Design an enzyme around this catalytic site. Structure first.
Site, PDB file in Angstrom:
ATOM      1  N   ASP B  61      28.000  20.519  18.030  1.00  0.00           N
ATOM      2  CA  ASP B  61      27.211  20.976  16.895  1.00  0.00           C
ATOM      3  C   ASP B  61      26.076  19.956  16.760  1.00  0.00           C
ATOM      4  OD1 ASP B  61      29.226  18.925  15.977  1.00  0.00           O
ATOM      5  OD2 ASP B  61      28.287  19.250  14.007  1.00  0.00           O
ATOM      6  N   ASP B  67      13.691  23.302  10.452  1.00  0.00           N
ATOM      7  CA  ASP B  67      13.184  24.659  10.608  1.00  0.00           C
ATOM      8  C   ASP B  67      14.281  25.738  10.620  1.00  0.00           C
ATOM      9  OD1 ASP B  67      13.598  24.630  13.894  1.00  0.00           O
ATOM     10  OD2 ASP B  67      12.703  22.767  13.153  1.00  0.00           O
ATOM     11  N   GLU B  90       9.043  34.494  10.641  1.00  0.00           N
ATOM     12  CA  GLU B  90       8.355  34.039  11.830  1.00  0.00           C
ATOM     13  C   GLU B  90       9.389  33.725  12.897  1.00  0.00           C
ATOM     14  OE1 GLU B  90       6.810  30.053  13.491  1.00  0.00           O
ATOM     15  OE2 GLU B  90       5.247  30.700  12.103  1.00  0.00           O
ATOM     16  N   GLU B  91      10.479  33.072  12.497  1.00  0.00           N
ATOM     17  CA  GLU B  91      11.559  32.678  13.413  1.00  0.00           C
ATOM     18  C   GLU B  91      12.361  33.807  14.068  1.00  0.00           C
ATOM     19  OE1 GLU B  91       9.784  29.580  12.115  1.00  0.00           O
ATOM     20  OE2 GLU B  91      11.132  29.543  13.840  1.00  0.00           O
ATOM     21  N   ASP B 111       7.666  32.723   5.964  1.00  0.00           N
ATOM     22  CA  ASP B 111       7.569  31.670   6.957  1.00  0.00           C
ATOM     23  C   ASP B 111       8.389  30.545   6.296  1.00  0.00           C
ATOM     24  OD1 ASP B 111       6.852  29.773   8.827  1.00  0.00           O
ATOM     25  OD2 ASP B 111       4.696  29.908   8.470  1.00  0.00           O
ATOM     26  N   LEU B 113       9.219  27.579   7.055  1.00  0.00           N
ATOM     27  CA  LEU B 113       8.525  26.290   7.066  1.00  0.00           C
ATOM     28  C   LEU B 113       7.297  26.387   7.932  1.00  0.00           C
ATOM     29  CD1 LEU B 113      10.237  22.850   7.225  1.00  0.00           C
ATOM     30  CD2 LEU B 113       9.063  23.952   5.365  1.00  0.00           C
ATOM     31  N   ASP B 114       6.150  26.189   7.296  1.00  0.00           N
ATOM     32  CA  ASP B 114       4.851  26.241   7.929  1.00  0.00           C
ATOM     33  C   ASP B 114       4.323  24.815   8.130  1.00  0.00           C
ATOM     34  OD1 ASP B 114       1.711  26.324   6.597  1.00  0.00           O
ATOM     35  OD2 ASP B 114       2.112  27.379   8.506  1.00  0.00           O
ATOM     36  N   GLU B 273       1.721  34.598   7.043  1.00  0.00           N
ATOM     37  CA  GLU B 273       0.791  33.465   6.888  1.00  0.00           C
ATOM     38  C   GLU B 273      -0.505  33.889   6.188  1.00  0.00           C
ATOM     39  OE1 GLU B 273       2.144  30.543  10.629  1.00  0.00           O
ATOM     40  OE2 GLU B 273       0.318  31.729  10.781  1.00  0.00           O
TER      41      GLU B 273
END
Ligand SMILES: CCC[C@@H](C(=O)NCCc1ccc(O)cc1)[N+]1=C([O-])[C@@H]2Cc3ccccc3CN2C(=O)[C@@H]1Cc1ccc(O)cc1
Ligand SMILES: CCC[C@@H](C(=O)NCCc1ccc(O)cc1)[N+]1=C([O-])[C@@H]2Cc3ccccc3CN2C(=O)[C@@H]1Cc1ccc(O)cc1
Ligand SMILES: O=P(O)(O)OC[C@H]1O[C@](O)(CO)[C@@H](O)[C@@H]1O
Ligand SMILES: O=P(O)(O)OC[C@H]1O[C@](O)(CO)[C@@H](O)[C@@H]1O
Ligand SMILES: [Mg+2]
Ligand SMILES: [Mg+2]
Ligand SMILES: [Mg+2]
Ligand SMILES: [Mg+2]
Lengths: 328, 328
Positions: B61, B67, B90-91, B111, B113-114, B273
């Site tokens: 792990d 992210d 986005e992911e 998103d 985390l941008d 975005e």
């Protein structure tokens, strides 16, 4: 063996070094301050300013401002370390002379909060510092502040960004400590850090294009239009020196703040901005120059003297110096 | 009157709305998601990862990245809302269809985390979200997220900078809430946010100069060499869209990320975005164009469709638009 904390680290030095202790106390004081500043930056307890417990209709916006709170925290905390006699701060016109009953053998030049323009828009900001041991026996006075960065015993900065990190540079190298805000300990995450030989990012404020000197101008054209047809460098400029330099340190590249119309000798301050960062860069294996001479060897003549600086990866800075000679 | 927490704010929008109370539950979810991410971003508990309690038999792990974590927090917390049916992240290569036994009537594009390039250097990063009401009346499909931003009912972002702020835009305006991390409440600190008409800061990655179209080139040149001989614009470019757009919002000015050779149709994504930022900008009385048309008017055919974007003060943006016009 196991985890290392700033407290432990600053102490191991104390054992090894075998000295009065003052520095270790001074550095602990610093930490205690950077933690307070950090919590304030993240705006803890702000609901109390907006009346969550009411306010009997009497709270004009007369709250001490973050910029001012930071100075107060650094002055008082360092003044309680008993390890200092002279303190220079961006927020004070004259060097602060420490009370006799608490003076120590160290001089500190600091910027309690760097990145003023980015304060209201929530961009990363920080605290900058450079420490000097007294250089004589005269009665304490600004005089001790004007020592060249070449004589720094320790230097560094605290970055209050996505997370808070304290970078400390000392004779033996540079280390990065991450603040665990849950227990209030700076954990060591990067040991004996070194900058990359050549980076791929250049950082400077291009809105000054019309005022750049021939060398800066040429250099910039190269990053965007590589004479040797190589990949153009990406551009990054946060507007907060701690943030830009920090990225330079960890990712590589170059950061520039040269002379321009209103800033003939540059904008950034020698004592508490250029010197600490230059020491950090050199101790990390990179360069830091005015474009003509190395920043650490300058002999300051006033405590708020400004200087032009260029720092970052060796090759990146070398090439720009190359260009300066070309124009000389 | 007295303090207003986002929670109080979201519950009252609802009352007026007189509906299923689903949006309220959704915004509640988001908030919880934002607070957890902010706490992760600031690195609380990091001492544990570095052995403060000794070997924690952590292996296979491999520790979870910020992210991945953030995405999981947002995906989980949204499902728990019972207010959504389709999630676009986005992911994720495909739109997430919320299982029937938890379906609400909203579609959210986000998103987690941008500014991912600024993660390792501790520069400001953030979470961007845009919310839609299910257009059709048949089985939830990717198609439902393929709506022009003009259809947004709510949009905004959580900026994890020096302090954490959540900016929320809805049909009647834009509001800013500061996160008080000591109690986990967001405090409204700026109501009915309006962007300034003209700015004095431009924000573009000039490292792509060689590939800019003639209009960008002309406008940029005009920012440094004001034909009206006035003071040139200052430059700022953090590298994380949220930080950059946020600055634009509170200081005014212009943010750009046009198309370049490797980015034929811009780099930024339309759904999670561009559209949300376009929406915030218009509700604040600013503009957002690709250079040819309004970002919000564009009709999507790919959930990960990219688009060019120019946003900020109307006067500055229109100045640039008239240049595209002239070159036509
Ligand atoms: C994190 C800020 C804490 C801050 C505060 O402003 N609290 C008010 C309520 C609150 C809590 C959290 C928050 O995010 C916003 C508002 N605070 C404390 O909670 C306690 C209170 C206290 C009482 C008696 C004796 C000592 C202390 C210590 N102590 C403190 O030194 C500070 C400042 C304080 C002290 C006394 C007060 O009546 C109000 C505030
Ligand atoms: C802020 C991290 C919190 C985090 C943690 O990592 N704790 C380890 C010690 C520590 C503390 C602070 C720090 O900055 C770094 C390490 N944590 C807790 O302290 C308590 C522990 C606990 C124990 C029993 C039952 C429930 C919980 C809840 N609880 C939590 O859910 C988390 C995770 C956790 C839970 C149990 C553990 O044995 C170790 C960690
Ligand atoms: O807006 P300018 O002139 O680029 O100034 C940027 C610099 O100002 C400073 O705030 C120092 O005053 C630095 O932190 C930052 O590098
Ligand atoms: O390196 P570039 O080309 O400036 O990309 C930066 C942009 O990409 C992003 O990280 C999104 O991928 C934005 O946050 C940002 O403005
Ligand atoms: Mg300052
Ligand atoms: Mg400064
Ligand atoms: Mg992401
Ligand atoms: Mg992004």
């Amino acid at each position: 063996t196991n985890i290392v904390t700033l407290t432990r680290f600053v102490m191991e030095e104390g054992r090894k070094a075998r000295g009065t202790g003052e520095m270790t106390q001074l550095l602990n004081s610093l930490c205690t301050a950077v933690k307070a500043i950090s919590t304030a930056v993240r705006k803890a307890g702000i609901a109390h300013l907006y009346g969550i417990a009411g306010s009997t209709n009497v709270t004009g916006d007369q709250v001490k401002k973050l910029d001012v709170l930071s100075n107060d925290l650094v002055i008082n905390v360092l003044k309680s370390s008993f390890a200092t006699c002279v303190l220079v701060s961006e927020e004070d016109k004259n060097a602060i002379i420490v009370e006799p009953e608490k003076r120590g053998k160290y001089v500190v030049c600091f910027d309690p909060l760097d990145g003023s323009s980015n304060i209201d828009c929530l961009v990363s900001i920080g605290t900058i510092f450079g420490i000097y041991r007294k250089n004589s026996t005269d009665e304490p006075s600004e005089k001790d502040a004007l020592q060249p960065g070449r004589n720094l015993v320790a230097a560094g900065y605290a970055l209050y960004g996505s997370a808070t990190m304290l970078v400390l540079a000392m004779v033996n190298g540079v280390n990065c400590f991450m603040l665990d805000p849950a227990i209030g300990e700076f954990i060591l995450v990067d040991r004996d850090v070194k900058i990359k030989k050549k980076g791929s990012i250049y950082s400077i404020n291009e809105g000054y294009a019309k005022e750049f000197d021939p060398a800066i101008t040429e250099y910039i054209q190269r990053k965007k239009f590589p004479p040797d047809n190589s990949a153009p460098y990406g551009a990054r400029y946060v507007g907060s020196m701690v943030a830009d330099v920090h990225r330079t340190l960890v990712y590589g590249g170059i950061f520039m703040y040269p002379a321009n119309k209103k800033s003939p000798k540059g904008k950034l301050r020698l004592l508490y901005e250029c010197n600490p960062m230059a020491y950090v860069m050199e101790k990390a294996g990179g360069l830091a120059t005015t474009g003509k001479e190395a920043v650490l060897d300058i002999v300051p003549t006033d405590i708020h003297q400004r200087a032009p600086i260029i720092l970052g990866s060796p090759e990146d800075v070398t090439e720009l110096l190359e260009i300066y000679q070309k124009h000389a």
